[PDB]
Design a protein around this motif. Sequence first.
Motif, PDB file in Angstrom:
ATOM      1  N   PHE A   8       0.814  -1.211   0.000  1.00  0.00           N
ATOM      2  CA  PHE A   8       0.000   0.000   0.000  1.00  0.00           C
ATOM      3  C   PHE A   8       0.851   1.266   0.000  1.00  0.00           C
ATOM      4  O   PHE A   8       0.343   2.342   0.331  1.00  0.00           O
ATOM      5  N   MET A   9       2.135   1.163  -0.352  1.00  0.00           N
ATOM      6  CA  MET A   9       3.016   2.325  -0.282  1.00  0.00           C
ATOM      7  C   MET A   9       2.582   3.410  -1.263  1.00  0.00           C
ATOM      8  O   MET A   9       2.540   4.595  -0.913  1.00  0.00           O
ATOM      9  N   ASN A  10       2.253   3.026  -2.494  1.00  0.00           N
ATOM     10  CA  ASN A  10       1.829   3.983  -3.508  1.00  0.00           C
ATOM     11  C   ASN A  10       0.317   4.142  -3.585  1.00  0.00           C
ATOM     12  O   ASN A  10      -0.164   4.963  -4.373  1.00  0.00           O
ATOM     13  N   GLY A  30      -4.879  10.404  10.934  1.00  0.00           N
ATOM     14  CA  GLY A  30      -3.948  10.082   9.866  1.00  0.00           C
ATOM     15  C   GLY A  30      -2.645   9.506  10.384  1.00  0.00           C
ATOM     16  O   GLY A  30      -2.098   8.561   9.808  1.00  0.00           O
ATOM     17  N   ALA A  31      -2.130  10.063  11.482  1.00  0.00           N
ATOM     18  CA  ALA A  31      -0.941   9.494  12.106  1.00  0.00           C
ATOM     19  C   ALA A  31      -1.206   8.076  12.598  1.00  0.00           C
ATOM     20  O   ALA A  31      -0.356   7.189  12.456  1.00  0.00           O
ATOM     21  N   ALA A  32      -2.388   7.846  13.176  1.00  0.00           N
ATOM     22  CA  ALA A  32      -2.742   6.510  13.644  1.00  0.00           C
ATOM     23  C   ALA A  32      -2.826   5.519  12.490  1.00  0.00           C
ATOM     24  O   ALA A  32      -2.378   4.374  12.614  1.00  0.00           O
ATOM     25  N   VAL A  33      -3.403   5.935  11.360  1.00  0.00           N
ATOM     26  CA  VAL A  33      -3.506   5.023  10.224  1.00  0.00           C
ATOM     27  C   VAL A  33      -2.135   4.785   9.597  1.00  0.00           C
ATOM     28  O   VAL A  33      -1.854   3.681   9.111  1.00  0.00           O
ATOM     29  N   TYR A  34      -1.252   5.792   9.607  1.00  0.00           N
ATOM     30  CA  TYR A  34       0.126   5.565   9.182  1.00  0.00           C
ATOM     31  C   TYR A  34       0.808   4.537  10.073  1.00  0.00           C
ATOM     32  O   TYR A  34       1.496   3.633   9.581  1.00  0.00           O
ATOM     33  N   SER A  54       2.166   0.887   8.882  1.00  0.00           N
ATOM     34  CA  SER A  54       3.565   0.530   9.090  1.00  0.00           C
ATOM     35  C   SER A  54       3.699  -0.743   9.919  1.00  0.00           C
ATOM     36  O   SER A  54       4.539  -1.600   9.617  1.00  0.00           O
ATOM     37  N   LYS A  55       2.882  -0.887  10.966  1.00  0.00           N
ATOM     38  CA  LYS A  55       2.987  -2.062  11.825  1.00  0.00           C
ATOM     39  C   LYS A  55       2.398  -3.303  11.166  1.00  0.00           C
ATOM     40  O   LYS A  55       2.809  -4.424  11.487  1.00  0.00           O
ATOM     41  N   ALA A  56       1.445  -3.131  10.252  1.00  0.00           N
ATOM     42  CA  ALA A  56       0.820  -4.254   9.567  1.00  0.00           C
ATOM     43  C   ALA A  56       1.531  -4.630   8.273  1.00  0.00           C
ATOM     44  O   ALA A  56       1.115  -5.587   7.612  1.00  0.00           O
ATOM     45  N   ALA A  57       2.587  -3.906   7.898  1.00  0.00           N
ATOM     46  CA  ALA A  57       3.319  -4.228   6.680  1.00  0.00           C
ATOM     47  C   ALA A  57       4.101  -5.529   6.798  1.00  0.00           C
ATOM     48  O   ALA A  57       4.476  -6.107   5.772  1.00  0.00           O
ATOM     49  N   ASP A  58       4.360  -5.999   8.019  1.00  0.00           N
ATOM     50  CA  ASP A  58       5.091  -7.243   8.216  1.00  0.00           C
ATOM     51  C   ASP A  58       4.335  -8.178   9.152  1.00  0.00           C
ATOM     52  O   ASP A  58       4.481  -9.402   9.069  1.00  0.00           O
ATOM     53  N   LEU A  59       3.525  -7.611  10.048  1.00  0.00           N
ATOM     54  CA  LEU A  59       2.790  -8.423  11.012  1.00  0.00           C
ATOM     55  C   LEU A  59       1.502  -8.974  10.408  1.00  0.00           C
ATOM     56  O   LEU A  59       1.316 -10.193  10.318  1.00  0.00           O
TER      57      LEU A  59
END
Lengths: 74, 75, 74, 74, 74, 74, 74, 74, 74, 75, 52, 41, 59, 104, 132, 221, 37
Positions: free
Chosen positions: L3-5, Q20-24, Q28-33
């Motif tokens: 979902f980066m882009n 927005g910070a929370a969704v970022y 980020s935390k769900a990109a690998d978990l």
Amino acid sequence: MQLVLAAKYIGAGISTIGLLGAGIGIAIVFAALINGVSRNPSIKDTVFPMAILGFALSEATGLFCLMVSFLLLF
Amino acid sequence: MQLVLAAKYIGAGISTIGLLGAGIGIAIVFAALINGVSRNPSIKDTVFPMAILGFALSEATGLFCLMVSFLLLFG
Amino acid sequence: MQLVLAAKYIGAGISTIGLLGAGIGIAIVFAALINGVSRNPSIKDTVFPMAILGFALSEATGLFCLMVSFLLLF
Amino acid sequence: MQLVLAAKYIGAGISTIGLLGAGIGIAIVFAALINGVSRNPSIKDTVFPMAILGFALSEATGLFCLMVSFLLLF
Amino acid sequence: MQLVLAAKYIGAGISTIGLLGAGIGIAIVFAALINGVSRNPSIKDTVFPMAILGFALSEATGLFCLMVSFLLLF
Amino acid sequence: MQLVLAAKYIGAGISTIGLLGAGIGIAIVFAALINGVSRNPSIKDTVFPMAILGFALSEATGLFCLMVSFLLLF
Amino acid sequence: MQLVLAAKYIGAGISTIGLLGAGIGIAIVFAALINGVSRNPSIKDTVFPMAILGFALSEATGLFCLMVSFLLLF
Amino acid sequence: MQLVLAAKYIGAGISTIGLLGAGIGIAIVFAALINGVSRNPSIKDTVFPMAILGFALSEATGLFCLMVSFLLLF
Amino acid sequence: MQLVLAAKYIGAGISTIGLLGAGIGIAIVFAALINGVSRNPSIKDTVFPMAILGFALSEATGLFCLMVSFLLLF
Amino acid sequence: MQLVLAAKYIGAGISTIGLLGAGIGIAIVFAALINGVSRNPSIKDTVFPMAILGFALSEATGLFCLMVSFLLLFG
Amino acid sequence: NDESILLLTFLGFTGLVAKYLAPAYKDFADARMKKVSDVLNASRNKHVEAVK
Amino acid sequence: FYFMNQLTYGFLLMITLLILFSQFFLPMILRLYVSRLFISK
Amino acid sequence: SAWRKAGISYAAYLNVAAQAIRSSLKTELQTASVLNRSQTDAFYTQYKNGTAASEPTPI
Amino acid sequence: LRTHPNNIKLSINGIGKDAPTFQESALIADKLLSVMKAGTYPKISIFYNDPVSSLSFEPSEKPIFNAKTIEQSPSFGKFEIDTDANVPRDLFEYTLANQMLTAM
Amino acid sequence: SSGLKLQFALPHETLYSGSEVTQVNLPAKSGRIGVLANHVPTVEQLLPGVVEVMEGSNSKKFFISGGFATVQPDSQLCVTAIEAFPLESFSQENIKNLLAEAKKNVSSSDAREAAEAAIQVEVLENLQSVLK
Amino acid sequence: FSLYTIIVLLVITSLYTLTNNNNKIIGSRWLISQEAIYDTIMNMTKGQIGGKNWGLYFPMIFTLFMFIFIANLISMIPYSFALSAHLVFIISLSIVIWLGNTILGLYKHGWVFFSLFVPAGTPLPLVPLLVIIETLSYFARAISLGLRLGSNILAGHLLMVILAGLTFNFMLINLFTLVFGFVPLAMILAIMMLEFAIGIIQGYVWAILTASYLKDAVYLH
Amino acid sequence: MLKRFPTPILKVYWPFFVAGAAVYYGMSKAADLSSNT
């Protein structure tokens, strides 16, 4: 091997269950037409000719369900 | 052939129960048409374009369920 | 894996059964629109907005109902 | 795992049925809303926002049915 | 020859449901009949013809399940 | 060993269908509420709390259906 | 004929559902009947033959459900 | 021993589905509450206790179907 | 021999779905009945005859579903 | 013997379906009761008896399905 | 081709829009332009009469 | 789950909407309206 | 029945109902008030800006 | 005629022959609501004198409520109405008849 | 309030005005309405028919020729009326039937008169049913 | 997908920058297409969140409104720009809006924000049930916003795609070159007019729902 | 033509920025978990 034809048969049978829409449809439209004519006796000549169009439209759903059922029969 | 095509045809049979909504919808569409026009005739010119919008959209959703059935009956 | 995709197809079908609620809802909101304008003409220009929103919501119910069908199907 | 996933998918497909009532009812709420606002043009200010909250709470039931359908799927 | 006949019987048994359309047909058709004649005693020679036509066209699509079921039963 | 979990999923999926019952409950409650508050705006603060408790108990039945769905699944 | 007889039993058991047609039909017809005889007494002799006509024509639907259920049983 | 509890869960689910009647009924009688108390608020305390004692056992209809479901589960 | 008696049990179980007819019918016939009686009580002894006939017919449909369930059971 | 009780449980559930009709009717009948007493406050004393009679026999209709569910579950 | 039918259909809706939506929207927009013009001239008339 | 882009770029773009539009466009629509008001009195 | 749509008006509905009630009664019930009710002589005339009397048609 | 000949457009003669009769008043109301369409005018004024006990008189006027102010009103929800019965127009014509008859 | 205060008024001779009454069954626009005590407020026209007034006296048939089902929240129902109906003197058949037949014979006039003739025929049928 | 999202930025930036010939007061032919929608937005916003602080809490609902309605508009081009058939951004920002109104309520009210889940008057024996009745619906309506828009837009995109792919034998080999054999094109065009209609109506209705949640946040009901 | 107007930048949208910070953080935390891809 015969399961294909068998499942076709139950599918067509449950596809006839598409006829309820048309049935209760004819029901409510005709009944509401009766109520409307009862409320206004002079409006029958202006309600029935338009009503024929919707009768065709409500037979349309019935024959659609019928022909999708028929595709599973023949 | 076999169970995959059998299940495809079973889905074809089941998917048409959604047309219940389309049929009853066009039905109550015209029921409301007839009742409202019977309440007063002068409102027909204002209700008829909304009437055509209404029944056209009802068989639009009918078309939606029938083509989902069409896709479900084929590959 | 054949029966898995078979049950995927059945799941899609039993999911798209659920657009009949959308079909009733769209028609009934438009029905409220039309009898409301019929009993008094001056309210149509205010009633039409929430009538078309009634359409939007009622159809959206069916769309997200068979969204799980499309996910099941695809 | 084959029939397990098949039955999970079937369970999601049936779980999404839990929204026919939501689909027609979240429409009838606005239908009666517009009927009432046609009955009195001037009550809109107080009949609208609580109608929308009842809308959210009536879409909630379909919301949980798709949530449990997703749980069945995922 | 065995599961095919089983499917024939199953499909006929589920398809004969489709006369709910004829049932609710007669239901609301003579409901409106009685309501109209009670509210409009003079209006009988108009309500009755549309009433019997409503009965006929509702039961036609109601028994369009029954006759395919007979075609499916045998 | 695995179709036991399959039946668990099927039972949960068929259990979560009681949600639309609560949906109809709460929706028709709200529809009656605004139909009856459109006439006599003054009768609002007495139709408020009992409306609250009514859709609360309807949603309570729906959420109990959700809870038994979860228990069957979990 | 073993599974054939089992499917015959299922077919009868799902044929007997369709009596809801007659059940709602005759009942709401005669609810309208009792409403009509209440609202004005002069229409009783005119509605009652219609009431028994609906009685016969909906017990007809009951009877079709009867002998489609019985045909598979016997 | 396996399909035993599988069908036990199936039965528990197909018993939990039986909450629709209570869910719709409590709210339809409560809709009668709303429209009646809007018609006349002077007899609110006359229509309230009858309503309480009625929809209490209307939810008890649920309670019996839930007892059936629990006996089907445990 | 397990599956034939299983079919008998399943058919007997589903034969009770017909109670919607009977129950809803008696409910609506006396709903309209008490509505009419409240609208005027001078016609009690005239509206009561077709009311007891209403139990007769609706409970007769009920007894049909009962006897199918019993014949499938026994 | 396993399919015996399995189908017994399935039949008990599909029998306890027939309780939805009761759950609807028992409530709608006294819905109309309260609607009538709202229309006529003093007519409760006479509209109560037969309305609650139909109400109780609708309880009995639902009890048939409850009893047959127990028969297919406890017998 | 799937991409053949799509472009023809889009041409179809462009033609339908130009046939039906474009004229009605044009009349509505021109009516609003005219209304703004006449209210501007009414403001000018009020100003000049007040000055007179 | 890539979902980066799709998430970051879209999120930043919608900040651009929320800021730039509310700074330029709706303000000058309202400027048109208030100028019409001012000339109309 | 159709007074609003096909009939003259609601006032005509009351007029015809009262006339039927008064006329279709016993001979001794036709009192002086009933006689006045039966006798109508409202000769309405449609005037104009120049007081152009159209006609004094009976009611 | 001598005050505002242009405004007047309808005149009725042969009314004050004797004591009032209901039939003539109702027919006059029907004619007035038909040819003049009193429903269009939101307000209808009826002029008629009122003696207090014997001698002193005042030009009492009673407002007439049209169907527009019956279908909607500040307190129309108190009284149950039937939409299918067209009770707004019915009550408008009924008050136009009763108020005018008793005014005359 | 206990009971109802019926105000039965006529342009020629009023019948009741704030009098105690148990049942005021009156022929509403749709049908006929039964009023017992503290009825829901409502406004609605009445078709001609028997206005059944139960009071301390015996059975009292009161055929009406027009009125409203106007009920106050305070149970002060006011049934306006035009023509009264004696319990036994009004009931006659020969003159009513002759007038009905004459009006049916002369009912072939123009449409404006045809609607009035049809409504007169229907109210004559109502009178015949009321005669009993 | 990144270059495709810039396109909608360019098109709606040109709505006024590339429209006004001289910034005339009368308005250009495309300045009207935005002032009319601005008028509609201000109208139903003052209708729904009417009262104080409505003006301060209008602009982000407005921004979401154009975001969604041009996002639906770009889904008409045949290479449909339906978020490149991913549409998870709608869900993510629906959750974002839910967190936003949650913080709105928690700052405007604080402990009173917990009274947003209970109405003004409830029976004493029944409040402990109705509080949990009204809470989970509130936390759950954070996906209901997303699935609506997702449903309509991508359902349309894939139904036109499916119909186009299913249209293989219509004129090449099939002898039925009439509407009977051209049912695919007919229902494609019907569903595209339907798609435009539902897109605009759903943008307006989601504006309504977001305004309603903001009203629930900044006020108490 | 183009007007840079001083408008509220974060005085009313600050909870949206926290969201927005929370969704970022969640992405980020769900990109690998929670990615599972």
